[PDB]
């Protein structure tokens, strides 16, 4: 009578497969608002 082959694994080998990696490319960077000009002139200078 021939012996049937071995068909067993440890839980580590079938559950802990070397996993694929998550998406490394996650770049975010907020833009800079365009500044507005300065439009003031002191009251002594405006009219004296």
């Amino acid at each position: 009578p021939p012996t049937l082959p071995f068909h067993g694994e440890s839980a580590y080998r079938t559950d802990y497969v070397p996993k694929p990696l998550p998406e490394v490319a996650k770049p975010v960077e907020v833009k800079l608002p365009p500044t507005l000009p300065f439009n003031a002139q002191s009251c002594y200078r405006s009219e004296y």
Binding site: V28, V30, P33, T35, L36
Partner: peptide
Amino acid sequence: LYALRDHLDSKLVPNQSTDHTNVLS
């Protein structure tokens, strides 16, 4: 450094930044 908790929802002036009815005529 992912400054989302400083992500401006305001502008240079203080305020903040930019985010039916069937009328009986």
